[PDB]
Design a protein around this ligand. Structure first.
Ligand SMILES: NC(=O)c1cnccn1
Length: 378
């Protein structure tokens, strides 16, 4: 031991340990139970995790995130060429493989995606060592069900560079089903995993029988998540600010970014309260922006995006050749599945069926990976 599971996520990662028969999800040095998959290069140092995400606005060209969208792919791949148009950092080609290019200590450096992901995994490993004491040797690391062998191997390579024994690479939806004990809960079970993250949406249909998992279908949207909901709140409240103070913040990127920060936090509050307060000091020309937003307003601004999540569900069913009534278990994954309106649409779509949601959905994948690590060690 220790028995360690790592969710290596597109924008956030999570590490758990299995100890005394149960999973403990591990908070990092800032007390956060999830850690940004961010790596920043400055004039003097390499920052990882919270420290990297916290200076992203100040240093956007040298702060890497989304390395998971590059790992195991070729520079010429259509997704890479399309994704590159939206990143503030530079992506270059070496022997046909993508690399991020940054300034670090005054010089140009290039890193393979598995090198950036290794720096992330090193941070996750140190987070678990600060929690446990001593050293971590081994981990189960998770990947999307649609990852091919090149993406799986490059993820493993990130673990190898970090100096972890990678016990197994398992699918993220499988790890979530494991967290709920669905392989132990004697028949086949069709399980739908609905995984709605900060910037990705994955629907997976699995069958589970006598502890064997098979992926039947996958669907979703690789560029839809919680950040899209925040953006709807940003446009709404920027218009409100314009209406109340006759000041357009739109051309000012610091004012938009600060509004966005407030909206992200308001949105989190709205999954447990019916209202949230925005309290921005000196948003624009010394003018404060103090206001409040209701859950009903947030749901309205997002009507298309929330209802639209049911369309990959229907596609995954059609591809699996299943009627919705043939799903035995529905599993919520990703921070965005906390939104009550999303849970209601999904539940009504499944004719009132209860959702597996008792595990923090942003932790379920690391939770299942930690159970799997315990099994493999043992
Ligand atoms: N959503 C936005 O980024 C936004 C909206 N209105 C003005 C400026 N930015």
């Amino acid at each position: 031991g220790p028995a360690i599971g790592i969710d290596l996520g597109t924008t956030y990662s999570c590490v758990g340990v299995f100890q005394h028969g149960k999973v403990e999800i591990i908070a990092n040095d800032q007390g956060n139970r999830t850690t940004p998959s961010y790596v920043a290069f400055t004039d003097t140092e390499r920052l990882i995790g919270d420290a990297a995400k916290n200076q992203v606005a100040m240093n956007p060209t040298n702060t890497i995130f989304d390395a998971k969208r590059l790992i195991g792919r070729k520079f010429e791949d259509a997704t890479v060429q399309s994704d590159m148009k939206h990143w503030p950092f530079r992506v270059v080609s070496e022997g046909g493989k993508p690399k991020v290019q940054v300034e670090y200590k005054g010089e140009t450096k290039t890193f393979f995606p598995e090198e950036i992901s290794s720096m992330v995994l090193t941070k996750m490993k140190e987070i678990a060592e600060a929690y446990l004491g001593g050293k971590v040797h081994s981990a189960v690391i998770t990947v999307p069900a649609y990852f091919n062998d090149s993406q799986r191997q490059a993820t493993k390579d990130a673990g190898t560079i970090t100096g972890l024994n990678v016990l197994r690479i398992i699918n993220e939806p499988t790890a979530a089903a494991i967290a709920y004990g669905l392989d132990k809960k004697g028949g086949e079970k069709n399980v739908l995993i609905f995984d709605l993250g900060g910037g990705t949406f994955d629907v997976s249909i699995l069958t589970i029988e006598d502890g064997i998992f098979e992926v039947k279908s996958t669907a979703g949207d690789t560029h839809l998540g919680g950040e899209d909901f925040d953006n709807r709140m940003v446009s709404h409240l920027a218009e409100e600010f314009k209406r109340k103070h006759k000041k357009d913040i739109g051309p000012n990127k610091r004012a938009v970014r600060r509004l966005r920060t407030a909206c992200e936090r308001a949105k989190r509050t709205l999954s447990s309260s019916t209202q949230a307060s925005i309290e921005i000091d000196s948003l624009y020309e010394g003018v404060d922006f103090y206001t409040s937003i209701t859950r009903a307003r947030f749901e309205e601004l997002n009507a298309d995006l929330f209802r639209g999540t049911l369309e990959p569900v229907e596609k995954a069913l059609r591809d699996a050749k299943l009627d919705k009534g043939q799903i035995q278990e529905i599993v919520l994954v990703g921070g965005s599945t906390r939104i009550p309106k999303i849970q209601k649409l999904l539940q009504d779509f499944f004719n009132g069926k209860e959702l597996n949601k008792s595990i923090n959905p942003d932790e379920a994948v690391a939770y299942g990976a930690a159970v799997q690590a315990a099994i493999l060690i043992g």
